[PDB]
């Protein structure tokens, strides 16, 4: 069994910038979710080998995790807030696509996703 390579977190070909909205995504949004008691499954890519999930990367073709998002934000990988918000959404959606309603991991993602929506609701206007 093998895991795919993780999503990239550095690419000199990719346009990027800092924006006050990206700063909020790191300092408020990512920091809030990262410290949550249910963050830990989401702090790195799914290890389909150790977890014995050989079908994971057949069903989830756009993997994403908060370890990758945190690196992307600390490395200033994004051009805009929407790119980063779409990474969070891909992470939650992947969890709901692979798992069953009411599974623990789905309750975990729902708790993180509730906080994420409450914080993104107050994304600042772009300076």
Ligand X SMILES: COC(=O)C[C@@H]1N=C(c2ccc(Cl)cc2)c2c(sc(C)c2C)-n2c(C)nnc21
The answer to whether 49 contacts ligand X (rule: CB under 6 A) is no
Nearer to ligand X (CB atom), residue 9 or residue 19: 9
* List 105, 111, 115, 123, residue binding ligand X (CB under 6 A): 105
Choices 14-22, 27-35, 40-48, 70-78 (CB under 6 A): range interacting with ligand X: 40-48
- Other residues' Cβ atoms within 10 Å of the Cβ of residue 47: 11
Give me the numbers of helices (H) and strands (E) for the chain, helices first please.
6, 0
Write down the residue that tokens 């990027």 correspond to: 16
Per the CB < 8 A criterion, the answer to whether 111 and 38 are in contact is: yes
Residues that bind ligand X (CB under 6 A): 41-42, 46, 51, 53, 95, 98-99, 104-105, 108
């Amino acid at each position: 069994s093998m895991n795919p390579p993780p999503p990239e977190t550095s690419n000199p070909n990719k346009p990027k910038r800092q924006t006050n909205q990206l700063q909020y995504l790191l300092r408020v949004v990512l920091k809030t979710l990262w410290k949550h008691q249910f963050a830990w499954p989401f702090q790195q890519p799914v290890d389909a080998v150790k977890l014995n999930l050989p079908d994971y990367y057949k069903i989830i073709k756009t993997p994403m995790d908060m370890g990758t998002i945190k690196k992307r934000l600390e490395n200033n990988y994004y051009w805009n807030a929407q790119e980063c918000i779409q990474d969070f959404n891909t992470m939650f959606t992947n969890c709901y696509i692979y798992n069953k309603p009411g599974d623990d991991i789905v309750l975990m993602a729902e708790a993180l996703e509730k906080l994420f929506l409450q914080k993104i609701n107050e994304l600042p206007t772009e300076e």
